[PDB]
Amino acid sequence: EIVLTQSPGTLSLSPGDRATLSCRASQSVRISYLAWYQQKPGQAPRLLISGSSSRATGIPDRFSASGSGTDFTLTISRLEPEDFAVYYCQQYANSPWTFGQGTKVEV
Amino acid sequence: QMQLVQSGPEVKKPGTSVKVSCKASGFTFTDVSSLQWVRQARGQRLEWIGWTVVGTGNTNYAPRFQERVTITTDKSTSTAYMELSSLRSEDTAVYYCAAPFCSETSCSDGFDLWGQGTKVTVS
Amino acid sequence: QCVNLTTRTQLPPAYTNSFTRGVYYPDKVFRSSVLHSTQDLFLPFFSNVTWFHVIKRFDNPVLPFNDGVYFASIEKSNIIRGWIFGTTLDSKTQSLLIVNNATNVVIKVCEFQFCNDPFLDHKNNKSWMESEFRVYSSANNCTFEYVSQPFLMDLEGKQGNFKNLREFVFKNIDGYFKIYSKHTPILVREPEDLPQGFSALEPLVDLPIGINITRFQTLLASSSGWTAGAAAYYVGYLQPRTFLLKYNENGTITDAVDCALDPLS
């Protein structure tokens, strides 16, 4: 029961450039219990940043987590050609969880 | 290794109860691990069904999934059984199970493990 | 709950020549018409016993305890209540409690935190009542509890006509606590003057407590200020000596003599 919106919806950036994405929620201000995932068409999503400050196993250092309020921003220094996926922000409120709309990036 | 295997894609008819599961090879649900189940349709954002705690036994579902989905986590067999009824055309999607690396010692606030999913469709 | 009563008038405690009193049956045996000499702990003949007179007067200091105490009280009102003592009374040290208020005897060995001026006397002028009974603040680690029948008791408090005369002796041997008591009624001697004569003291009970007592305090009984009558009690300290003791034909002790007072003795 969380209305989470991710921006921008579509991205067309040259490889090797720096990009930033944001996700917002209509619930209370939440920072440390929001996670970002990248998923592929036909492949299961895999966690990339969780806890707003920690990383999973094998996660590249390109991902950076920022944001002090409800807004959660993921910054990527370079868009390596395998980074073209759809991004989802997911909450851990123990309330009814709802995934984001999806941040799609294309070459 | 920390590996998980799910069932295969299936096609069924309306009005048939459906059992859905994903097992872990070398990974146990122990006393602290929990697990969530999510769904994804064709070109649609992920939707969360419910996450359950193996140890305490607390079960939380989606507000729209309070009537026909039952999730039971068994530590002895280390499995997650879902009984699903009244599968219309909207349930034709791929199911995923996510669990954290959390075995009786410590774990973070994310679901690192993820299943390849079952592509379940009902005509 | 306690109140800092203070207002402690000071009078010089007196010294009286305890002529002969202070003998008791040394052991739980029997013997008929013989003479037996034994070395034990006794009160010296013609020793100076400390005399305390409490009225307008309120005296109850910390009397030191050194291996045995002989306590002789001459009163009718039964103002003296019990014996409570530890080592510091700071909720940190083991403490012992002997109390017989109305119809019971409570025997406690526990942790206690007591007051600067503990007292159970004080309630509405000269109407005696067990006020301020909770002189102990709290109990941390209680060790021993015991309940028994009360001794001879006198109802209410009156001044004069101290017919009842009580003699107790308490000592600690091999950890056990031993008490020998004797109460003589209808004793007709008004103006003090501890009488001559002879009366030994039978044992009453043993207590398996095992504590080292460095000091003991007695207790007697609008929480400040009281109108109490005359009450006389005497304290003597035991010490080792050898006595000769005479048994009659029935078995009761009728005479005794020390071996360190007089060359004739």
Added chain:
Amino acid sequence: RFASVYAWNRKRISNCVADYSVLYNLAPFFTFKCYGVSPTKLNDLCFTNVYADSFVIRGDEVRQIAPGQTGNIADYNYKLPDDFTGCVIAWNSNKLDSKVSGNYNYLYRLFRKSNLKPFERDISTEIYQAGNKPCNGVAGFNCYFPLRSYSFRPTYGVGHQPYRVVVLSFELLHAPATVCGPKKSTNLVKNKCVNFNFNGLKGTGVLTESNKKFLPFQQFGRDIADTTDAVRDPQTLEILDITPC
């Protein structure tokens, strides 16, 4: 009713006589084993201080109560000392503890920071934070109740029915004696050379009836040369006389 495992109750026993034949002969005692002492030699040994521990457990974790075991119930609710004095008694009671509608009154500890010290009578109901991130307030992710209620039903079989277990531990002659077993009291023989043991006064002679006065202040007679010649019967107040064979 028995206290739960996480908050087991303790009763203090002292200054009384304990008979173990009634303890030994009772039928429904299923698990009756002792390590430091033998069950049959408890009627003739003096114990300084005896305290008992009572709780109700499941049928599966009956083994874990033994000293040296490790488990979620043997380390997070009650730990036994390495040198365990005394012993335990366990039995199955599915008639009383089990409830038809579901007995959920009993609970046990699940999550704790570390194993508790042996012989602890303390319990904390604070919430547990599974993750490294600080947690507080109301239960959330990686924040779960460290206690679970027992599930006992009459349909449950062996290994899941409630078990009532009592733990008895005591010292061994490290204090003045308080609780001791009963002593035998045979009949009395008069005018015959016997071996009397009146209240621990072993000796030999013949017992007769004397007219010496023994006021209850006195207990035991003697003679000029300090030889026993008169005793008082503990059963009846009559005073006997002793003369050598």
